[PDB]
Design a protein around this nucleic acid. Structure first.
Ligand SMILES: [Mg+2]
Ligand SMILES: [Mg+2]
Ligand SMILES: [Mg+2]
Ligand SMILES: [Mg+2]
Ligand SMILES: [Mg+2]
Ligand SMILES: [Mg+2]
Ligand SMILES: [Mg+2]
Ligand SMILES: [Mg+2]
Ligand SMILES: [Mg+2]
Ligand SMILES: [Mg+2]
Ligand SMILES: [Mg+2]
Ligand SMILES: [Zn+2]
Lengths: 108, 49, 45, 152
RNA sequence: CCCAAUAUCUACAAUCAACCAACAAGUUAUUACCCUCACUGUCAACCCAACCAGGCAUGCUCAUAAGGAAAGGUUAAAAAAAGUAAAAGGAACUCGGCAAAUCUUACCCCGCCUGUUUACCAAAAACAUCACCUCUAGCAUCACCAGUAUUAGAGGCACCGCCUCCUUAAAUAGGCUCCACGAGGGUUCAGCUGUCUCUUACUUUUAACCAGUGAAAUUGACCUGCCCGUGAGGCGGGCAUAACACAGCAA
């Protein structure tokens, strides 16, 4: 059907500003104790995750530049090595994806 | 005794490799045609600019 | 279903509303003159 | 009523559900780490685990080969499954994938999730460590370790 | 985007055009001219529907060499929509076997048949229609007609031939001759099935929540209760009564 009467600003305020409709204050924010950026407990530090995705993208660009075209999933493991890092004794027989910047401190 | 499926691209997919494989599909429809009549029919039936 | 009564056609449009069709009858010249008086800048279709 | 139904409903029906999960799983086997909506990743985790289980049986088995043929779409990955992934987990008997939640998607504010296969070459996800062992509460609990061990 | 003039001609189809078979009957001779390529369309995701599951002629591809994306994220409540499955029974549903599943039979009324009609509630038992009959009309160059009583116009009717107690357990239902036909109306056999006895599960859309964009009818004011009486949320007499979202329902 249709309304029988306009609804006043008072009723509309008792509806719109009722607590159930308010935005709740979040009790689960904190500071990355080492890195020092904001984060929720159960979620990754956004800044750290972005700085990881950047390096993943650069590595993957090198991988694409080396594999040539599509349909070339290798049949061996892969290892990524930064400048001035000779292939360790454990990484022989694994594809090497050379990169041209110093290894990040967070890359172990 | 490894039965590895072939390393080809897919037929129905919407990419460039799928397009090439469908090209090969109709070209193999003409390779497997015996009368020159049907070869010329299939090799010229699609009218484009 | 309705609403598509205008099936455009340049020949028809120029034949049944054009300058020459107006000028081919006194009524049409009156129409052109009315639209000259009212100021229109589209006298004939 | 939906008591005891473990399978999400997604896509345009059951078949599209299997196909969506199949594309997610193929992306995972190809890149070893993918960011996807949280619920879809949680649905695909079980399939990725069982795919590694089937891949351990090895090429020679035919059932595993048919299964990996269905569940991998670009077939270059089937070698990998049977020669890089399944060998990699010859020791672990379970839990080959780690799944995290990440900042919600910018456009549609969906609940996201990064899922990866343990042990890959990629830069490591920023996992959350626990509190250092030298914190006050941990030190008191360490004292209790000692004092309880000596008594017992 | 065209053509120098004048006279002449111009009887026999098309259908693979040959066999059979039909009816609706389907340019040059003379005179004049020895000049050369100008001008315009050419795009696109497009047009008519106020922006659009609608409308749009032809050629070719007949499932695609071309073209596209049914799900913003989540959960899997009701009511709703579409679909799939169903024990025993198989129309007991209902105005009616509408819908669905299966494929058979028999009759009756009306109309002869194919066709046409109320663009947007009626497709029919109405209109038209071959066949028959009645009335008028003896005839030139703008219709009837470049026709002439076996013709033309206007009406009625509707080929043709013949004349001017059973059914059910139970029943208010069904039972001029005249083949063929009907999304016409009524009845019946057999089957079939979630129509029903009597509902149930799953899937998709809707849905509810998160994020973006964001209408419309309606609206005197409202601080918007129940029962009985008067003539009803609002009057009277009793009763009840802390405020506030959200999803349902329809008194
Ligand atoms: Mg063009
Ligand atoms: Mg295409
Ligand atoms: Mg959905
Ligand atoms: Mg869509
Ligand atoms: Mg949605
Ligand atoms: Mg049944
Ligand atoms: Mg008919
Ligand atoms: Mg009919
Ligand atoms: Mg909203
Ligand atoms: Mg009363
Ligand atoms: Mg309400
Ligand atoms: Zn951090």
């Amino acid at each position: 059907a249709a309304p029988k009467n306009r609804r006043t600003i008072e009723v509309n305020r008792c509806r719109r500003r009722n607590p159930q409709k308010l935005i709740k204050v979040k009790n689960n924010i904190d500071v990355c104790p080492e890195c020092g950026h904001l984060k929720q407990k159960h979620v990754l530090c956004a800044y750290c995750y972005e700085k990881v995705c950047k390096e993943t993208a650069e590595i993957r660009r090198q991988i694409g530049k080396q594999e040539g075209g599509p349909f070339k999933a290798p049949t061996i493991e892969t290892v990524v090595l930064y400048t001035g890092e000779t292939p360790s004794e454990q990484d022989q027989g694994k594809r090497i994806i050379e990169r041209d910047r110093k290894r990040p401190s967070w890359f172990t | 005794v490894a039965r590895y499926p072939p390393i080809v691209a897919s037929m129905t997919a919407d990419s460039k490799a799928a397009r090439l494989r469908r090209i090969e599909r109709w070209q193999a429809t003409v390779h497997a045609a015996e009368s020159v009549d049907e070869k010329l029919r299939i090799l010229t039936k699609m009218q484009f600019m | 279903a309705r609403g598509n009564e205008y099936q455009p056609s340049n020949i028809k449009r120029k034949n049944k509303h054009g300058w020459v069709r107006r000028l081919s009858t006194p009524a049409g010249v009156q129409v052109i003159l009315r639209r000259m008086l009212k100021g229109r800048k589209s006298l004939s279709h | 009523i939906s008591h005891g139904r473990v399978f999400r409903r997604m896509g345009l029906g059951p078949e599209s559900r299997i196909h969506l999960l199949r594309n997610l799983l193929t992306g995972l086997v190809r890149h070893e780490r993918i960011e996807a909506p949280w619920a879809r990743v949680d649905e695909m985790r079980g399939y990725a685990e069982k795919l590694i289980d089937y891949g351990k049986l090895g090429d020679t088995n035919e059932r595993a080969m048919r299964m990996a043929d269905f569940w991998l779409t670009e077939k270059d990955l089937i070698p990998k499954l049977f020669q890089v992934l399944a060998p990699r987990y010859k020791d672990q008997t379970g839990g080959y994938t780690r799944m995290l939640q990440i900042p919600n998607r910018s456009l549609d504010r969906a609940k996201m999730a990064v899922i990866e296969y343990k042990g890959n070459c990629l830069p490591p996800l920023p996992l959350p460590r626990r509190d250092s062992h030298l914190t006050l509460l941990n030190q008191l609990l360490q004292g209790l370790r000692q004092d309880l061990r000596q008594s017992q």
